[PDB]
Coordinates of N, CA and C in Angstrom, one line a residue:
Chain A
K1 N -39.3 38.4 19.5 CA -38.3 39.4 19.9 C -37.2 39.5 18.8
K2 N -37.4 40.7 17.9 CA -36.5 41.0 16.7 C -35.5 42.1 17.2
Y3 N -34.3 41.9 16.7 CA -33.2 43.0 17.0 C -32.5 43.4 15.9
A4 N -31.9 44.4 15.9 CA -31.0 44.9 14.9 C -29.9 45.9 15.6
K5 N -28.8 46.1 14.9 CA -27.7 46.9 15.4 C -27.5 47.9 14.4
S6 N -27.3 49.1 15.0 CA -26.9 50.3 14.1 C -25.6 50.3 13.6
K7 N -25.5 50.5 12.2 CA -24.2 50.4 11.7 C -23.5 51.8 11.6
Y8 N -24.4 52.9 11.7 CA -24.0 54.3 11.8 C -24.8 55.1 13.0
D9 N -24.1 56.2 13.2 CA -24.9 57.1 14.1 C -26.0 57.8 13.3
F10 N -27.0 58.2 14.0 CA -28.2 58.8 13.4 C -28.5 59.9 14.5
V11 N -28.6 61.2 14.0 CA -28.9 62.2 14.9 C -30.4 62.6 14.4
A12 N -31.3 62.6 15.4 CA -32.7 63.0 15.2 C -32.7 64.4 14.8
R13 N -33.4 64.8 13.8 CA -33.4 66.3 13.4 C -34.4 67.0 14.2
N14 N -35.2 66.2 14.9 CA -36.2 66.9 15.9 C -36.8 65.9 17.0
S15 N -37.5 66.4 17.9 CA -37.9 65.5 19.0 C -38.9 64.4 18.6
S16 N -39.3 64.3 17.4 CA -40.2 63.1 17.0 C -39.5 62.0 16.4
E17 N -38.0 62.2 16.3 CA -37.3 61.1 15.8 C -36.4 60.6 17.0
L18 N -35.8 59.4 16.8 CA -34.9 58.9 17.8 C -33.4 58.8 17.4
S19 N -32.6 59.5 18.1 CA -31.2 59.4 17.9 C -30.6 58.0 18.4
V20 N -29.6 57.6 17.6 CA -28.9 56.3 17.9 C -27.4 56.5 17.6
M21 N -26.6 55.8 18.3 CA -25.1 55.7 18.1 C -24.7 54.4 17.4
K22 N -23.6 54.5 16.6 CA -23.1 53.2 15.9 C -23.1 52.1 17.0
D23 N -23.4 50.9 16.6 CA -23.2 49.7 17.4 C -24.3 49.6 18.4
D24 N -25.3 50.5 18.6 CA -26.4 50.4 19.4 C -27.3 49.2 19.0
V25 N -27.9 48.6 20.0 CA -28.9 47.5 19.6 C -30.2 47.9 19.9
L26 N -31.0 47.6 18.9 CA -32.5 48.1 19.2 C -33.4 47.0 18.9
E27 N -34.6 47.0 19.5 CA -35.6 46.0 19.4 C -36.5 46.5 18.3
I28 N -36.9 45.7 17.3 CA -37.7 46.1 16.2 C -39.2 46.0 16.7
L29 N -40.0 46.9 16.6 CA -41.3 46.9 17.1 C -42.4 46.9 16.0
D30 N -43.6 46.5 16.3 CA -44.7 46.5 15.2 C -44.5 45.5 14.2
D31 N -43.6 44.4 14.4 CA -43.2 43.5 13.4 C -42.8 44.1 12.0
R32 N -41.8 44.9 12.2 CA -41.2 45.6 11.0 C -42.2 46.3 10.1
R33 N -43.3 46.6 10.5 CA -44.3 47.4 9.7 C -43.4 48.7 9.4
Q34 N -43.6 49.3 8.1 CA -42.9 50.4 7.7 C -43.6 51.6 7.8
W35 N -43.1 52.8 8.1 CA -43.7 54.0 8.3 C -43.0 55.1 7.4
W36 N -43.9 56.1 7.2 CA -43.4 57.3 6.3 C -43.7 58.5 7.2
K37 N -42.7 59.5 7.0 CA -42.9 60.8 7.8 C -43.8 61.6 6.9
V38 N -45.0 62.2 7.3 CA -45.9 62.9 6.5 C -46.3 64.1 7.1
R39 N -46.9 65.1 6.5 CA -47.4 66.3 6.9 C -48.8 66.5 6.5
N40 N -49.8 66.8 7.3 CA -51.2 67.0 7.1 C -51.5 68.4 6.5
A41 N -52.7 68.5 6.2 CA -53.2 69.8 5.6 C -53.0 70.9 6.5
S42 N -53.0 70.7 7.9 CA -52.7 71.9 8.8 C -51.3 72.1 9.2
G43 N -50.4 71.5 8.6 CA -49.0 71.7 8.9 C -48.4 70.7 10.0
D44 N -49.2 69.9 10.5 CA -48.8 69.0 11.5 C -47.9 67.9 10.8
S45 N -46.8 67.5 11.5 CA -46.0 66.5 10.9 C -45.8 65.2 11.8
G46 N -45.7 64.1 11.3 CA -45.6 62.8 12.1 C -45.5 61.6 11.3
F47 N -45.3 60.4 12.0 CA -45.1 59.1 11.3 C -46.5 58.4 11.2
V48 N -46.8 57.8 10.1 CA -48.0 57.0 9.7 C -47.5 55.8 9.0
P49 N -48.3 54.6 9.3 CA -47.8 53.3 8.6 C -48.1 53.5 7.2
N50 N -47.1 53.1 6.3 CA -47.4 53.3 4.8 C -48.2 52.3 4.2
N51 N -48.7 51.2 4.8 CA -49.5 50.3 4.2 C -50.9 50.6 4.0
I52 N -51.3 51.7 4.7 CA -52.7 52.2 4.5 C -52.8 53.6 3.7
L53 N -51.6 53.9 3.1 CA -51.5 55.1 2.2 C -51.3 54.7 0.8
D54 N -51.9 55.5 -0.1 CA -51.7 55.2 -1.6 C -51.2 56.4 -2.1
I55 N -50.1 56.4 -2.9 CA -49.4 57.4 -3.5 C -50.4 58.0 -4.6
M56 N -50.5 59.3 -4.9 CA -51.2 59.9 -5.8 C -50.4 60.3 -6.9
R57 N -50.8 60.0 -8.2 CA -50.0 60.3 -9.4 C -51.0 60.6 -10.6
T58 N -50.4 61.4 -11.5 CA -51.2 61.7 -12.7 C -51.6 60.5 -13.5
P59 N -52.8 60.5 -14.1 CA -53.3 59.2 -14.8 C -52.3 58.8 -15.9
Chain B
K1 N -43.8 68.4 -5.0 CA -44.4 67.9 -3.8 C -45.0 66.5 -4.0
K2 N -44.7 65.5 -3.1 CA -45.1 64.2 -3.3 C -46.4 64.0 -2.3
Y3 N -47.5 63.4 -2.9 CA -48.7 63.3 -1.9 C -49.2 61.9 -1.9
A4 N -49.9 61.5 -0.8 CA -50.5 60.2 -0.6 C -51.9 60.4 0.0
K5 N -52.8 59.4 -0.3 CA -54.2 59.6 0.4 C -54.4 58.4 1.3
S6 N -54.8 58.6 2.5 CA -55.1 57.6 3.5 C -56.3 56.7 3.1
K7 N -56.2 55.5 3.1 CA -57.3 54.6 2.7 C -58.1 54.3 3.9
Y8 N -57.6 54.3 5.1 CA -58.3 54.1 6.4 C -58.0 55.1 7.5
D9 N -58.6 55.0 8.5 CA -58.3 55.8 9.6 C -57.1 55.2 10.4
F10 N -56.4 56.1 11.1 CA -55.2 55.6 11.9 C -55.3 56.4 13.1
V11 N -55.2 55.9 14.3 CA -55.1 56.7 15.6 C -53.8 56.6 16.2
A12 N -53.2 57.7 16.5 CA -51.8 57.7 17.0 C -51.8 57.3 18.3
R13 N -50.8 56.6 18.8 CA -50.7 56.0 20.1 C -49.5 56.7 20.8
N14 N -48.8 57.5 20.0 CA -47.6 58.1 20.6 C -47.6 59.6 19.9
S15 N -47.0 60.5 20.7 CA -46.9 61.9 20.2 C -46.0 62.0 18.9
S16 N -45.3 61.0 18.5 CA -44.5 61.1 17.3 C -45.2 60.6 16.2
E17 N -46.4 59.9 16.4 CA -47.3 59.4 15.4 C -48.4 60.4 15.1
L18 N -48.9 60.5 13.9 CA -49.8 61.4 13.4 C -51.2 60.8 13.2
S19 N -52.1 61.2 13.8 CA -53.5 60.6 13.6 C -54.0 61.1 12.2
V20 N -54.6 60.2 11.4 CA -55.2 60.5 10.2 C -56.6 59.9 9.9
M21 N -57.3 60.6 9.1 CA -58.6 60.1 8.7 C -58.7 59.6 7.2
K22 N -59.5 58.6 7.0 CA -59.7 58.1 5.6 C -59.9 59.3 4.7
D23 N -59.3 59.2 3.6 CA -59.4 60.2 2.5 C -58.6 61.6 2.7
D24 N -57.7 61.5 3.8 CA -56.9 62.7 4.1 C -55.9 62.5 3.0
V25 N -55.4 63.8 2.6 CA -54.3 63.9 1.6 C -53.1 64.3 2.4
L26 N -52.0 63.5 2.4 CA -50.9 63.9 3.1 C -49.6 64.1 2.2
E27 N -48.7 64.9 2.7 CA -47.6 65.3 1.9 C -46.5 64.3 2.4
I28 N -45.8 63.6 1.6 CA -44.7 62.7 2.0 C -43.4 63.3 2.2
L29 N -42.7 63.3 3.3 CA -41.4 63.9 3.6 C -40.2 62.9 3.5
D30 N -39.0 63.4 3.3 CA -37.9 62.6 3.4 C -37.8 61.7 2.1
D31 N -38.2 62.2 0.9 CA -38.2 61.4 -0.3 C -38.7 59.9 -0.1
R32 N -39.7 59.9 0.8 CA -40.2 58.5 1.0 C -39.4 57.5 1.8
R33 N -38.4 58.0 2.4 CA -37.5 57.1 3.3 C -38.3 56.1 4.2
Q34 N -37.9 54.9 4.4 CA -38.6 54.1 5.3 C -38.1 54.0 6.7
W35 N -39.0 54.1 7.7 CA -38.7 54.1 9.0 C -39.3 52.9 9.8
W36 N -38.7 52.5 10.9 CA -39.1 51.4 11.8 C -39.3 52.1 13.2
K37 N -40.3 51.4 13.9 CA -40.5 51.9 15.2 C -39.6 50.9 15.9
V38 N -38.8 51.5 17.0 CA -37.8 50.6 17.7 C -37.9 51.0 19.1
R39 N -37.2 50.2 20.0 CA -37.2 50.5 21.4 C -35.7 50.3 21.8
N40 N -35.1 51.4 22.3 CA -33.6 51.2 22.7 C -33.4 50.5 24.0
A41 N -32.1 50.4 24.4 CA -31.7 49.7 25.6 C -32.3 50.3 26.8
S42 N -32.5 51.8 26.7 CA -33.1 52.6 27.9 C -34.7 52.3 28.0
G43 N -35.2 51.5 27.0 CA -36.7 51.2 27.0 C -37.5 52.3 26.4
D44 N -36.9 53.3 25.9 CA -37.6 54.4 25.1 C -38.0 53.9 23.7
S45 N -39.1 54.3 23.2 CA -39.6 54.0 21.9 C -39.4 55.1 20.9
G46 N -39.2 54.8 19.6 CA -39.0 55.9 18.7 C -38.8 55.4 17.3
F47 N -38.7 56.3 16.2 CA -38.5 56.0 14.9 C -37.0 56.4 14.4
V48 N -36.6 55.3 13.7 CA -35.2 55.4 13.1 C -35.3 54.9 11.6
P49 N -34.5 55.5 10.6 CA -34.5 55.0 9.3 C -34.0 53.6 9.2
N50 N -34.7 52.7 8.4 CA -34.3 51.3 8.4 C -33.2 51.0 7.6
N51 N -32.6 51.9 6.9 CA -31.4 51.6 6.1 C -30.1 51.7 6.7
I52 N -30.1 52.1 8.0 CA -28.8 52.1 8.7 C -28.7 51.0 9.7
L53 N -29.7 50.1 9.7 CA -29.6 49.0 10.6 C -29.3 47.6 10.0
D54 N -28.6 46.8 10.8 CA -28.3 45.4 10.3 C -29.0 44.5 11.2
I55 N -30.0 43.6 10.6 CA -30.7 42.7 11.4 C -29.7 41.8 12.0
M56 N -30.2 41.2 13.3 CA -29.3 40.3 14.0 C -30.1 39.0 14.3
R57 N -29.5 37.9 14.2 CA -30.1 36.6 14.5 C -29.2 35.8 15.3
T58 N -29.8 34.9 16.1 CA -29.1 33.9 16.8 C -29.2 32.6 16.1
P59 N -28.0 31.8 15.9 CA -28.1 30.6 15.2 C -29.0 29.6 15.8

């Protein structure tokens, strides 16, 4: 059972994000695995775990 | 534009998560800011940026 407290307010820019108020206590899920917000080829947007993604860059 | 390629498949379990297939090319949003999956006092699940949170621990 991992917990954290929000130091600042956070307003979700859309329904896929979660709004929180300063001092709110939250339970951290998935064992702190980190996520990135991404958009696919068809314009769909959402969160994906970043440990299975590889950044693409010029050689 | 910043892009990443998925190395494995990922099946969304929530409407805020985006299902992806191996080899899919995704556009990374929010300048790669890192997010955590959390659950609030109300029991709702969601994503919040991890840099506004202070970890909490009991001695």
